[PDB]
Symmetry: C2
Subunit: 378 residues, 2 copies
């Protein structure tokens, strides 16, 4: 199965197409990061919204790690303003925050309790039809959240999932002026996220030729361009920006697997993209040792990069990490914390729904071992 | 820009998903090629419609390469039945005829002459919002009509387009059992159309990276699998079936170019896929010599197939036509008839909206030369 709800609008200066898209709307709410404010893209968007006749109200300064707490703060100002159009302008977390906001705005009754993918052996209640349009404008490259029907959300320190077609954005605007403001480390971290997403999407149980096309292109693009992007080349920034959305389209359809699950649960340690990169080569070694299907798919990606084998790809991924100064796991977190948490982390990873999609289902013990293998820098 | 209205359902035996898809509709009309009746798929589909609780009515035997008069034949039968869901099961011809029917069913005041892209120097009247749902189920591999917003009809030996997102299908079902009953020539002809779609979509002025991904995968898949499919390999049939839709998604977004325009205006000679194959190598040479952008883009494609240059790609296409027994143009039509028609085809091709998307705009006398080159088999 393959589909795409989101309309994509790409190109230098495509932020301006925002005027077309607000036509016929009256009250526009914009959530943005501070960096979007300080670089003047928020103003620029406010102009475009005004000159299309609509009222506009902005909130900037948003944390990462969205929560039902923080969404409480907003909802009155939100609910009083009476928006009929939401705009998210920033990273994954900003987009996910706006996505989560849409649900409580549009379905104020909805018991948060009842809708969250916390366990994979739990089956939450479905989310009704919502209504407010949602435009996503990503400033990083990136999380894939501008096309996905998923947002993550804390209700007091605990992480739940919301998953439904209803919060996949209606429109995504990809203007590479925005991601050209990423500091080098952020360009690195979020670009490795693309790579991990693509490789995982290619190797799930539910991959199709349609998602494969997108995954493969994102992979080749990151492999070829990310190092130049990190050094701040402007064209390379644009290419990786588009590839980030490609990987998004892929994992929207094919989903993800063990590596993302493992990153979710070690969130406390580090940024999402960085931990993913750290784990990937171990998850690949595991998958390839245990599944012929996984081994063949990795070889297919290797050939597409101009190599031959599954082992080529694993080694090339380790060398990419080394090249871009990705730290060992031992450098991010001391032995003592890590070791006392590894079992708890394994159990949570085991209850995550994404391991349903991984080409091999790992036992709790094998997850434990993988954490330890990664830590030893094995 | 990139988008996709159509929801794709793929897989062996995926026809059975018709049941889910018609649920809560009352009157379903199926328009089908003769081959779908003879080979049993039409009964199968009817059974699925029935068990979803709908009334079903089928018309089989819809003609290949339809002209405008097909509308007056079948429209009265559609009006009499009053469907609330149209299903098209057949090649691009059947799907195009169904789309056209939808237009005149939902919007009875329109006629073909108003709304078709007859002349790129006159704006046709726009098609209003339509309403009847349309499910496309292609049985060739393929025209890509199951995801495109176009319907192609002949008037006076010459093909014109109707183009609107309103006739992009809502759902496409890709079940490779269906194209397995194609005769070899039908497999060849529809398969080479996938290749031509992909190459033209890759080299228009409005190619994006998103349409590029789909275009490139379709090309690779065809290049590798079509010879085996033509011989009757069952796997290769499935692979090329999914590629045809990939190419359709590409050209839905990137459009097409001079090779399709020329084939439209020579439609009286032969079937569409065969004409496209014959012209392509000449169009490519022309574009490559006139445009550096086209040259570099053909080379990218050559590299992806494991060659190096634009020139390699042209040679590859010529060799593949040979290997598959594509006739020379001179076998299809006598010289004195062709040569008497050629100034008119060229002038009409020049007025085709598709030449605006080609990487260079030819003059009519350059088009006339192209036609004659192809005739000589240069
Ligand atoms: N809308 C668009 O975007 C678009 C783009 C490109 C081309 N086109 C159009 O599409 C048409 C060509 O479509 P096409 O290449 O799919 O061929 P087609 O013209 O629909 O069909 C060609 C022949 O194949 C036979 N057939 C089809 N499926 C079969 C199966 N499973 N088993 C056995 N026989 C089968 C049909 O025989 P029966 O009639 O006996 O069943 C028919 O005679 C042209 O009119 C062209 O203009 C449209
Ligand atoms: Fe075609």
């Amino acid at each position: 199965m393959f589909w795409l709800k989101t309309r994509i609008i790409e190109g230098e200066g495509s932020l301006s197409r925002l005027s077309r898209e607000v036509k016929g709307h009256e009250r526009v709410l914009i959530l943005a990061s501070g960096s979007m404010k300080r670089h003047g893209f928020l103003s620029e968007a406010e102009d475009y919204v005004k000159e299309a006749g609509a009222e506009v109200f902005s909130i900037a300064g948003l944390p990462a790690e969205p929560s039902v707490e923080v969404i409480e703060e907003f909802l009155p100002k939100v609910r009083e303003f009476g928006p009929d159009l939401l705009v998210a302008m920033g990273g994954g977390s900003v987009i996910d925050t706006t996505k989560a906001l849409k649900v409580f705005y549009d379905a104020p009754e909805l018991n948060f309790g009842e809708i969250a993918f916390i366990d994979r052996f739990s089956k939450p209640k479905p989310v009704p039809r919502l209504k407010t349009l949602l435009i996503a404008i990503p400033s990083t490259s990136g999380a894939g959240s501008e096309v996905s029907g998923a947002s993550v959300l804390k209700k007091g320190g605990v992480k739940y999932n919301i998953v439904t077609p209803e919060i996949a954005p209606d429109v995504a605007i990809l203007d590479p002026r925005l991601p050209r403001t990423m500091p080098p480390e952020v360009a690195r971290n979020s670009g490795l996220d693309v790579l991990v997403h693509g490789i995982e999407a290619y190797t799930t149980k539910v991959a199709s030729p349609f998602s494969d096309a997108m995954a493969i292109k994102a992979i080749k693009t990151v492999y070829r361009w990310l190092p130049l992007s990190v050094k701040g080349d402007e064209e390379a920034r644009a290419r990786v920006h588009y590839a980030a959305t490609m990987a998004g389209i892929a994992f929207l359809n094919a989903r993800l697997g063990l590596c993302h699950a493992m990153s979710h649960k070690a969130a406390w340690i580090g940024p999402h993209g960085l931990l993913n990169a750290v784990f990937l080569p171990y998850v690949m070694e595991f998958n390839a040792s245990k599944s012929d299907y996984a081994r063949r798919r990795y070889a297919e990606i290797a050939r597409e990069l101009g190599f031959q084998t599954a082992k080529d790809l694993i080694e090339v991924v380790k060398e990419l990490n080394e090249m871009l100064g990705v730290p060992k796991l031992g450098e991010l977190v001391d032995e003592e914390t890590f070791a006392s948490k590894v079992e708890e982390m394994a159990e949570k990873t085991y209850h995550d729904g994404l391991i349903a999609f991984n080409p091999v289902e790992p036992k709790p013990e094998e997850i434990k071992e993988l954490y330890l293998k990664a830590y030893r820098g094995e």
